[PDB]
Design a protein around this ligand. Structure first.
Ligand code: ZN
Ligand code: ZN
Ligand code: ZN
Lengths: 129, 49, 147, 64, 42, 111, 49, 85
């Protein structure tokens, strides 16, 4: 699955393909069907083989090239998808992933402003991945 | 005051989960464990608000 | 694929399937034999992948006995053709060859439709029965139609 | 209990259609075809799953 | 490097709509029908 | 575990040998017969617990959606596991948790 | 709120989480503003009405 | 939701112990409700048993078909419902 996942993140396989590992039922399902509804998400580095871990793969360098329109030796949305920083997930693959709501939730923090809203405690699991 | 009463209610719900998962929860008449569990949590949260 | 038998009602709790263009429900074992895999021991080796699971094996018990007397491929294929919405009087010499089309095509056509590939349909059929019994054994919730 | 059923099959001998009656005795696994016209009779074994089309099929093969 | 800010998120989103717009699922679907699907149906 | 004839692959049925007064396992398509190792022929569990623990797979720790705990493994004493309540879908099922050590894959509880 | 995903209410939570925030307790007031998770749950209850 | 409202005689209604007696007599209990497991053995010798577990039970107690029907009662449900063997 790691190899297959990396083929989608580079462009060798069409980015709209779904790669779904259901570990509990011991089933691995792949869909190239027409008509699946999907949405894009930022990819978070999950491999414990680099200092990159726990952070967003996308950086201001990509953001820099987006505003310019060109690489430093057209560069738009689909350029990001075939460079492994954004991927598409559909409803079936969404079942097997863990999504942070905002970039700030990727890292733990150090308030008491009685006007502003309370952020959830999230104390049922000790460490989220 | 408002924030404290909600904070303490979340703790009691934690205690209920602990009791139910360690077989220390009273069963309500006519109800299975999961019904009794769901029932007690709902009463706590509506009284908290 | 329908599982008959209510809770302590329905006596023999067997399983019959429904095939396109056939008027009546046909027991599972019969269609397994009709595809070219006939001894019991191979049939159960295609469905259940856990020889210890006696609860699942006990539920397949009545299905074997209600389809025991159909002991070879030819009488199985003919049992099918005698129900499949055709005309009256196509004789055994051909009523088999009409049912072989209803099995090769129309039945699971998404897997394949070329000849000599009946191993894929037999293996897939076993998967279905396996999934059917997991829900009946309360080991897996029924599917959520709105997912 | 025996089942006496009329069918829409054609007799293989007299050719009268809608005149073949099927008597299926499941207690003894014996099925019986009868012609309401020329009066012929044909016996064949039946199981529990059989229907008038099962023995009428066996009658077509018993002739040929 | 540094952290992705709220303004940076909208830069990414701007690139999406610049390329795809709002009705691309209508247009791409029909385009695939004229290029290929008609031919296959024949 | 119910078995099949080693020469015909059809299923064996239990039948008594009246003359020698012993239990046999007989076939139904041929003459093969063999001796029964177990006097028990059938069991029906009304109050059952089977499949509670069953789904223990080797890659359950690769699933990042599972919550993680601090519980000490009895075998290797690792500080890293996944846990989950019972996968039994009965309505009266308990809510007690199963923990799986990612090293030896043993299943324990909090009782 | 039911587990419409497999053993969880939304993909932003871990499985088998029965805490208040996981099963639809909206802690904030309308004045304070709702968080994104709370928002969807509120829209589920509202739709049913 | 069919339901009965069963008022009790006054002398019984103010004594919780007597009311529990009434409770157990009204409540339907089948054999299926208290049975945990059933078994079918081949026990050919009527005066003995291959089962080592029921050895001391049947041997001392005793001091037709070879097929045996052996059913087990759950101790907890039998104790709560106040039923004797
Ligand atoms: Zn005639
Ligand atoms: Zn044999
Ligand atoms: Zn370990």
């Amino acid at each position: 699955v790691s190899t297959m996942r990396d083929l989608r993140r580079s462009g060798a396989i069409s980015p709209e393909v779904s790669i779904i590992r259901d570990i509990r039922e011991r089933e691995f399902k792949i869909f190239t069907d027409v008509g699946r509804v999907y949405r894009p998400l930022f990819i978070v580095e999950d491999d414990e083989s680099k200092d990159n871990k726990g952070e967003l793969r996308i950086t201001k360098e990509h953001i820099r090239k987006i505003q310019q329109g060109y690489d430093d030796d057209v560069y738009g949305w689909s350029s990001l998808v075939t460079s492994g920083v954004i991927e598409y997930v559909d409803g079936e693959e969404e079942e097997t992933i863990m999504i942070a709501m905002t970039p700030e939730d990727l890292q733990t923090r150090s308030l008491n402003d009685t006007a502003k809203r309370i952020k959830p405690e999230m104390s049922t699991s000790s460490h989220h991945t | 005051e408002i924030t404290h009463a909600i904070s303490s209610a979340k703790e009691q719900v934690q205690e209920i989960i602990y009791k139910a998962q360690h077989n220390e929860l009273e069963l309500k008449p006519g109800m299975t464990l999961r019904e009794s569990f769901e029932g007690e949590v709902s009463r706590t949260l509506n009284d908290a608000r | 694929i329908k599982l008959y038998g209510r809770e302590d009602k329905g006596t023999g709790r067997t399983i019959k399937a429904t095939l396109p263009y056939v008027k009546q429900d046909i027991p599972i074992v019969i269609v397994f034999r009709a595809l070219g895999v006939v001894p019991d021991g191979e049939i159960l080796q295609h469905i259940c992948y856990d020889e210890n699971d006696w609860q699942m094996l006990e539920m397949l018990k009545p299905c074997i006995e209600e389809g025991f007397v159909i002991q070879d491929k030819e009488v199985a294929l003919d049992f099918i053709g005698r129900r499949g919405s055709a005309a009256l009087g196509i004789r055994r010499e051909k009523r088999i060859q009409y049912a072989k089309d209803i099995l090769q095509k129309e039945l699971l056509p998404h897997i394949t439709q070329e000849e000599g590939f009946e191993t894929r349909k037999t293996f897939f059929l076993g998967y279905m029965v396996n999934r059917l019994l997991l829900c009946a054994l309360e080991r897996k919730d029924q599917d959520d139609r709105d997912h | 209990i025996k089942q006496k059923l009329e069918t829409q099959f054609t007799c293989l001998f007299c050719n009268h259609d809608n005149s073949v009656v099927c008597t299926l005795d499941k207690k003894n696994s014996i099925g019986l075809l009868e012609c309401k016209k020329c009066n012929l009779s044909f016996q064949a074994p039946i199981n529990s799953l059989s229907q008038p089309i099962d023995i009428y099929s066996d009658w077509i093969d018993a002739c040929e | 490097d540094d952290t992705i800010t709220t303004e940076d998120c909208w830069t990414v989103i701007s690139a999406f709509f610049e390329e795809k717009g709002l009705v691309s699922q209508q247009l791409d679907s029909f385009d695939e029908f004229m290029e290929t699907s008609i031919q296959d149906l024949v | 575990s119910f078995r099949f004839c080693l020469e015909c692959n059809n299923m064996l049925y239990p039948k008594e040998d009246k003359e020698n007064q012993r239990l046999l396992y007989s076939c139904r398509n041929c003459d093969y017969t063999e001796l029964a190792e177990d006097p028990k022929v059938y069991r029906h569990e009304l109050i059952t617990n089977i499949g509670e623990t069953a789904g223990i797979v080797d890659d359950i720790g690769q699933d990042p959606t599972l919550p993680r705990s601090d519980k000490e493994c009895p075998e290797c004493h690792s500080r890293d596991c996944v846990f989950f309540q019972s996968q039994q879908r009965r309505k009266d099922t308990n809510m007690t948790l199963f923990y799986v050590c990612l090293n030896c894959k043993k299943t324990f509880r909090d009782e | 709120i039911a587990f419409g995903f497999a053993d969880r209410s939304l993909p932003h939570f871990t499985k088998d989480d029965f805490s208040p925030e996981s099963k639809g307790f909206v802690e904030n007031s309308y004045l304070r503003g709702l968080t994104p998770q709370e928002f969807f749950f509120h829209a589920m209850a509202g739709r049913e009405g | 939701t069919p339901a009965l409202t069963v008022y009790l005689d006054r002398e019984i209604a103010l004594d919780i112990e007597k009311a529990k007696v009434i409770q157990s007599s009204i409540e339907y209990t089948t054999l299926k409700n208290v049975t945990s497991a059933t078994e079918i053995y081949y026990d050919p010798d009527p005066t003995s048993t291959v089962i080592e577990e029921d050895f001391d039970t049947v041997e001392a107690y005793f001091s037709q078909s070879p097929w045996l029907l052996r059913l087990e009662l759950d101790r907890a449900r039998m104790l709560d419902k106040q039923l004797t063997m």
